[PDB]
Each structure stands twice: as structure tokens, then as C-alpha cells.
């Protein structure tokens with residue numbers, strides 16, 4: 174199990 | 186962008202020596218700004234056109250999750266592997282063109298589940314097994330080309346298959362029927 | 371020989387791995403201390419450090435450990451090995467450091483962990499653990515760093531944990547953990563880094579959390595936490611990172627936050643936050659990333675954001691915001707990426723956005739923006755993705771776009787842009803998408819247009835176009851062309867068979883005439899063709915029915931005459947050819963011969 178880290182990426 | 190993740194699954198399992206998929210960016214709000222993907226005004230994917238992309242490798246069953254997918258064009262590529270029964274999970278699919286590839290395995294009976302389907306071309310592939318009868322329940326079917334394969338079986342003449350000349354089923358392994366040359370048991 | 375040696379040897383053989391891993395460990399006096407991964411205490415020969423990781427090594431972890439008693443360091447990482455965690459390791463006890471991370475260990479976490487006690491660093495990150503967080507670990511007073519994340523840990527966060535006075539760093543992130551976040555947590559005074567996200571929590575952020583002074587990194591993201599954002603948080607003066615994104619937070623953003631002067635990255639995205647932005651936000655001069663994406667946020671954007679010397683990533687998209695963008699925006703010269711789309715933003719685009727030429731992704735779309743398009747924007751080298759669709763931008767379009775070696779995506783569709791389309795547009799080397807559609811142009815396409823080196827999609831549809839359609843000269847990369855809805859006259863070029871990759875071509879609602887070139891019968895992948903509502907007259911090409919790829923031909927409302935092809939055309943829809951009074955065949959109903 175690896176987990177996301179950081180600011181939220183989603184983009185346009 | 187669920188279907189984005191799906192299209193990206195396909196991408197990841199895929200060999201793309203020329204980087205056409207290179208525009209396919211999982212962190213995008215949806216894949217409607219992707220190349221080779223075409224969405225509607227509701228921003229769901231209705232089209233994927235990868236024909237002639239020199240793609241190798243295979244497909245993932247995740248392709249089922251595109252609920253509004255209409256035209257899926259994968260033809261003329263090095264894509265091998267099997268054909269996912271989860272393609273039956275695509276209802277609004279009007280056209281499925283997988284032709285000119287290395288695909289192996291059966292033609293999924295789940296394909297008999299696409300009732301908006303008009304064009305079906307698996308021709309010039311490596312496919313084996315019989316021709317699923319449920320296919321005959323698609324009365325929207327216009328063009329069926331199963332020709333040039335390993336297909337074993339007997340060819341249906343009922344339902345939509347009423348309209349099909351032999352040029353559709355030509356050049357296979359043992360195939361038997363009145364739609365063809367040589368009858369059977 | 372020495373128990374150290376029996377131990378290391380037994381460890382060697384009990385771990386199945388590629389022989390490359392243990393290559394140097396064979397025995398002929400204090401020999402084992404040479405070995406790779408082993409470090410011994412130079413007086414005592416005892417093995418005080420054992421690092422073996424990314425060794426592609428799987429297996430069971432020997433019970434002949436604890437035979438090396440004075441051992442202060444144990445690192446096993448990335449090696450895929452599963453089990454219930456060994457309780458044997460707890461009996462090592464001089465350990466100050468233990469990394470079991472990125473492995474497969476599962477089931478529960480064995481209770482005996484407090485036996486270590488002098489333990490500083492524990493990293494269990496990325497394993498298959500299930501079960502409640504061991505409460506037991508709460509009793510090592512000297513524990514500094516604890517990473518339990520990357521597993522699936524059921525149950526709540528033991529409040530007991532708030533009692534590790536010396537704890538600097540805490541990672542529980544990416545587990546199944548749940549419920550209310552225990553207030554007792556504000557009692558780790560020494561605490562710097564806290565990452566607990568990606569689990570499922572509810573309730574508020576405990577006000578008591580304002581008690582961690584030394585706190586820097588705080589990420590609670592992707593949880594269910596809700597309610598108001600606590601004012602009190604404005605008091606962590608050391609805080610360089612705050613990620614609250616994807617939760618249920620509500621009400622206005624407290625003005626107090628204007629007080630983290632050390633704040634660098636702030637991400638509030640996908641929440642319910644309402645009301646304007648703090649006027650005081652203009653004051654964080656250490657701020658790099660600012661992301662408010664997808665909230666209920668309102669009011670103008672503080673003019674003061676114009677210069678934050680360090681501002682880099684600005685995401686305001688998907689709110690209802692009003693007023694001008696801060697006008698000196700981008701002048702800090704470090705600006706990289708901005709997306710303000712889906713708002714009520716009005717006024718003029720800042721001239722200085724690229725003042726430093728570090729800017730690549732610019733999304734201005736679906737706004738109330740008026741006025742001309744910044745000329746300075748053609749001076750931005752880094753420009754790669756630009757989408758301005760659905761705005762009031764006016765006047766002629768700026769002329770310098772073809773310079774940029776990096777620019778691959780452009781949407782100007784639905785604006786008030788008038789006059790000429792820039793000529794250099796098809797000279798620009800990388801540009802893969804161009805949408806100029808639905809504008810006021812009242813001019814014509816460039817000769818350059820079809821020469822675009824890599825350009826896939828092009829849409830000028832419904833902008834007031836006029837004139838002949840420039841001959842396609844070495845049509846290269848184009849798969850989709852929408853020229854429809856205009857005043858274009860003249861004829862469909864002789865050479866159109868130059869676009870091999872062409873798929874959908876919509877040419878309809880125009881002033882076109884002459885014939886329909888046979889060359890299209892030879893476009894190899896061609897799918898959709900919409901030619902309707904023109905003065906086109908001539909015949910429908912002989913060999914077209916021989917194409918396995920056309921599913922669409924709409925020639926309706928034209929002057930066409932002659933027979934329709936028997937071919938793929940048999941499977942076509944009659945109403946395609948209607949209002950062509952001169953066609954004969956089956957699908958028009960009137961026979962030839």
C-alpha cells in the first residue's frame with residue numbers, strides 16, 4: 174500500500 | 186474522470202512506441218481534452234480512435250466502464266491478447282472495430298449484449314472458438330466482418346445474420362453452415 | 371564461533387534473496403564485522419547496525435536475531451516479505467531506529483513494542499497491517515518519528531499517543547483509520563510534522579490542535595472531516611504546509627489565517643468554504659502554492675496578491691468570484707501555473723503574467739473577462755497549455771504566437787475576437803490543438819493553416835469566416851477539422867487527399883460550390899463528413915462506396931446531381947441526401963436508367 178502525498182493535483 | 190482512470194489503465198497496459206497516448210493525463214479533470222478521445226457535451230467519452238497508432242501489447246477490461254462509449258476504433262495495430270467480456274458492459278456502443286491485430290481467444294458471448302451495435306469488425310486477427318449466437322440478437326447490426334481468423338464452428342443464419350454473405354466469415358479453420366460452403370452434424 | 375556470527379549467518383540463510391544480496395558474507399575472528407550491511411562497535415565486535423533494503427529479499431525473519439544484542443539500527447525496506455510482524459524484534463531493545471517500511475507484513479501488530487523504549491525512529495510505512503493501531507507504542511517516551519501509514523489500520527487513533535513528549539513526526543496517512551480526531555493530540559509540543567490523511571475521520575479539527583507550536587506540515591486531506599475551520603489555527607507561526615483538501619469544511623475562512631507568515635503551500639480544495647478571501651492573505655510573503663479549487667468561495671480576490679515575491683501556483687477555479695484579477699499579478703516573475711476557470715471574474719487579463727517567462731499552464735476559461743488579449747502573452751516562451759474559452763475577450767488577436775517552441779494546446783473558442791486570425795499560428799512547431807470557433811473574425815484562414823508540423827485538432831467553426839479554403843499543402847497531423855457555419859465560398863481543394871489521418875470533417879452551412887473532389891474517396895481512415903446546406907453541384911464520386919471507414923456522409927441541401935454509390939453507402943441514411951433534387955439511386959427513391 175502506497176499513499177498519495179502533497180497538494181491536490183487535479184487540473185484543467 | 187472515472188473513465189479517465191479507465192482510459193489510463195488501458196494506456197498503462199499499452200505499448201505506445203510513438204507516444205500518441207502521451208496526451209493522456211490521469212490528473213486531468215476528465216479525459217475530454219485528451220487526444221484520440223472524444224467526449225460529448227455531457228463530457229463523457231463517446232469515441233476512442235487509436236487506429237494505426239503502432240500500439241503493441243494489450244487491453245484492460247476497464248474499458249467496460251465507459252458507459253457512453255459509442256465508437257471504439259482500435260484497428261490496424263499490433264495489439265494482441267484476448268478480447269474482454271466486459272466489452273459486453275458497453276451498451277451504447279454503436280461500432281466495435283478491432284480488426285487487423287494479433288488478438289487471440291474466444292469471441293465473448295457478452296458481445297451479444299450490444300443492441301445499439303451496427304458495425305462489428307474483428308477481421309484479419311488470430312481469434313479462435315465459435316461464433317456466439319447471441320450476436321444474432323443485435324438487429325441493428327449492418328456490417329459484420331469475422332473473416333480471416335482461426336474460428337472454429339458453425340455459422341448462424343438467423344436473426345441479423347440473415348443478411349450476411351460469406352465474405353463476412355471467409356477464410357477460417359473448420360466453420361460449417363449454409364452461410365458458408367461446408368455443412369455439418 | 372560467536373553468536374553474532376551464528377546470528378548473521380542464520381539471517382543470511384533464512385532470507386531468500388538473489389545471491390547478489392549476501393555475496394560477501396562467507397566465513398573463513400571478528401570476521402563478520404567486515405560484511406556488507408553490517409557495522410560493528412569497534413571495541414566490542416558486536417553488530418550495532420544492520421541495513422538491508424531494496425535487496426529484492428523475501429522470506430521469514432529469523433529467530434536467531436536478538437543474538438546480536440547491542441544493535442542500534444535495523445533497516446529493511448521495499449523488500450516484499452509478509453507475515454504477522456515478528457515479536458522477536460521487540461526483544462532487541464538497544465535499538466534506537468527501526469525501519470520495516472514498504473514491505474508486505476500483515477494481520478495485527480504484535481503488542482510487545484513498548485519494550486524498545488529508547489527507540490527514536492519507527493517506520494512501518496507501506497505494509498499489509500490490519501487491526502487497531504498498537505496502543506502500546508504510546509509508551510516509548512523518547513520516540514521521535516512514527517510512520518504507521520501505507521497499511522490498512524482499523525479503528526481510531528489512540529488518544530494515548532498524545533503522550534510522546536519528544537515526538538517530532540507522525541504519519542498515520544493512508545490507512546482505514548476513523549472517527550473523531552482525539553483532542554489530546556495538541557499535547558505533542560515538540561511535534562513538527564503531522565500527516566494523517568487518506569483515512570476516514572469526521573467532526574471538526576480539534577481547537578486544541580492550535581497548541582502545537584513547532585508544527586510545520588499539516589495534511590488531513592481526503593477524509594470526511596467537517597464543520598468550521600477553527601480560528602485558533604491562525605496561531606501556528608511555524609507552519610509551512612497546510613493541506614485540508616477534499617473534506618466537508620464550511621463557513622467562511624477565518625481572517626486569522628493571515629497570521630501564518632511562514633506559510634508556503636496552502637490547499638483547501640474540494641470543500642464547502644464560503645464568503646470572500648481574507649484581505650490579510652496579501653501578507654504571506656513565503657506563500658508559494660495557493661489552491662482554493664472547487665468550493666463555495668465568493669467576493670473579489672485581494673488586490674494584494676499582485677505581488678507575493680514567491681507566488682508560483684495559483685488555483686482559484688470552480689467558485690463564484692468577482693472583480694478584476696489582481697492587476698500586477700505575475701510581476702513577481704516566478705509565476706508558473708494559474709487556473710481561475712468557472713468563475714464570475716471580470717475585467718482585463720493582467721499584462722504582466724509572464725513578466726518572468728516562467729509561466730506554462732494558463733486556464734482563464736468560462737469567465738466574464740472582457741477587453742483585448744494581452745500582447746505580452748505572445749512573449750511568453752514557456753507557454754504550453756492555454757485555454758481561454760467562453761469569455762468576452764475582444765478585438766484583433768495578438769500576432770506573436772508562432773515563436774514558442776513549447777506551446778501545444780490552445781482554445782480561444784466563444785469570444786468576441788474580431789478581425790484577422792494570426793498568420794504565424796501554423797508555423798509554431800509543437801501546437802497540437804487549436805480552437806478559434808464561435809468568434810467575430812470577419813476575415814479568412816491563412817495559407818499556412820494546413821502546414822502545421824504537429825497539429826491534430828482544428829476548429830474555426832461558427833466564427834464569421836469568409837473566403838476560399840486554402841489548399842492543403844502537406845496536410846500532416848490533422849485528424850479533426852470543423853470549418854462549419856460560415857460564409858466561406860469557393861471550392862473544396864483538389865489536394866485534400868493530403869490529410870491521411872483525417873477522421874471527422876464538418877464543412878456544412880456554407881457558401882461552397884463547384885464539385886466534391888474524388889480525392890476524399892482515398893482518405894484511409896475517414897469517418898465523419900458533413901457537407902450540408904451549400905451550392906455544391908456535381909456528382910458523388912464513383913469509388914467512395916469502396917471505403918470500409920466512412921460511417922457519415924451528409925450532402926443534404928445542395929445542388930448535387932447524378933447517382934448515389936452502391937457500396938458502404940448501402941448502409942447509409944436516406945435523409946443524408948435529401949433536398950438534393952438531382953440525385954438518383956435507391957436511397958433517394960428515384961431510379962436511374
Ligand SMILES: *[C@@H]1O[C@H](CO)[C@@H](O)[C@H](O)[C@H]1NC(C)=O
Nearest residue numbers: 285308309310332333334356
Ligand atoms: C488478411 O489475411 C490474409 C491471410 O493471412 C492476408 O494474406 C491478407 O493480405 C490480409 N489482409 C490485409 C488487410 O493485409
Ligand SMILES: *[C@@H]1O[C@H](CO)[C@@H](O)[C@H](O)[C@H]1NC(C)=O
Nearest residue numbers: 318319321322341343344345
Ligand atoms: C436462432 O436465432 C435466435 C435469435 O433470433 C437465437 O436466439 C436462437 O438461439 C437461434 N437458435 C435457433 C436454432 O433457433
Ligand SMILES: *[C@@H]1O[C@H](CO)[C@@H](O)[C@H](O)[C@H]1NC(C)=O
Nearest residue numbers: 421423445447467469491493
Ligand atoms: C532506511 O533505508 C532506506 C534505504 O536504505 C532509506 O531510503 C531510508 O531513509 C532509511 N530509513 C531510516 C529512517 O533510517
Ligand SMILES: *[C@@H]1O[C@H](CO)[C@@H](O)[C@H](O)[C@H]1NC(C)=O
Nearest residue numbers: 630631632633654655656657
Ligand atoms: C521564508 O522562507 C525563507 C526560506 O525558507 C526563510 O529564510 C525565512 O525564514 C522565511 N520567512 C518567514 C516569513 O518565515
